[PDB]
C-alpha cells in the first residue's frame, strides 16, 4: 500500500495512513469476524486503541469510498452524532484519554456490486487536528 502507511495488527485489511502526521488516537488492533467481509452477512468489528487527547463535540470524519477509479461516496459526518447514533458501546462523544476496546456488529448489504473497493477515512477534531487516518481494500468476489 501507498507511502506514509503502516499495517494495523489483526485480522483486517486496514492500514494507518498519514503516519508522518501525529494522530491523537492510536488504533492498535482491528479484527473482523468474517475476515474478508462477505456481502449479505453480519460483520463483527473488534478494535483496540488509545486516546491521547479528549475528543469533544464538533469532531468530524471525512469518508471516501472508491470503486476502481469511481468516487462512489464522499462526505463528512458529525463524529459525535454518528457514534451516538450507531450505539458504539455507549461511548458518549466526550472521549477522554485512555485505553479503549470496541465491539460493533454491522450488516454488509448483499446488493453491493462485485469488485475492488477502497475505503479512506480521516477523523479530525473541531480545531482540525488529525485524530486518525485509516485505509483499506476489500475485494468482493465477482458473482454479482
Ligand X SMILES: CC(C)[C@@H](C)/C=C/[C@@H](C)[C@H]1CC[C@H]2C3=CC=C4C[C@@H](O)CC[C@]4(C)[C@H]3CC[C@]12C
Nearer Cβ to ligand NAG (34/113): 34
- Which residues of this chain interact with ligand NAG, rule CB under 6 A? 42, 105
From the list 134, 137, 133, 143, the residue with the least C-alpha distance to 117 is 137
Q: Does 43 bind ligand X (CB under 6 A)?
A: yes
Q: Which is nearer to ligand NAG, 20 or 105 (CB)?
A: 105
What is the total count of residues that contact ligand X (CB under 6 A)? 12
- Site for ligand X, residues 51 to 90, rule: CB under 6 A: 65, 72-73
Is the Cβ–Cβ distance between 39 and 140 less than 8 Å? yes
* CB contact burial 83-117 (16+ within 10 A = b; e otherwise): beeeeeeeeebebeeeebeeeeeeeeeeeeeeeeb
CB of 72 to ligand X, least distance (A): 5
Q: Cβ closer to ligand NAG: 5 or 44?
A: 44
CA distance 35 to 28: 17
Binding site for ligand X (CB under 6 A): 37, 43, 65, 72-73, 108-109, 112, 117, 119, 136, 138
Amino acid at each position: 500500500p501507498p507511502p506514509n502507511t503502516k499495517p494495523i495488527n489483526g485480522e483486517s485489511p486496514l492500514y494507518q495512513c498519514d503516519i508522518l502526521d501525529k494522530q491523537l488516537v492510536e488504533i492498535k488492533e482491528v479484527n473482523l469476524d468474517p475476515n474478508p467481509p462477505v456481502r449479505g452477512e453480519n460483520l463483527t468489528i473488534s478494535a483496540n486503541g488509545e486516546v491521547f487527547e479528549t475528543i469533544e463535540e464538533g469532531a468530524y470524519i471525512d469518508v471516501e469510498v472508491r470503486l476502481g477509479y469511481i468516487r462512489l461516496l464522499s462526505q463528512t459526518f458529525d463524529l459525535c452524532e454518528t457514534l451516538e447514533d450507531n450505539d458504539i458501546e455507549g461511548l458518549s462523544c466526550p472521549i477522554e484519554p485512555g485505553e479503549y476496546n470496541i465491539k460493533k456488529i454491522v450488516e454488509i448489504p448483499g446488493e453491493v456490486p462485485p469488485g475492488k473497493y477502497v475505503v479512506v477515512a480521516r477523523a479530525y477534531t473541531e480545531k482540525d487536528d488529525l485524530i486518525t487516518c485509516l485505509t483499506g481494500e476489500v475485494i468482493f468476489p465477482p458473482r454479482l
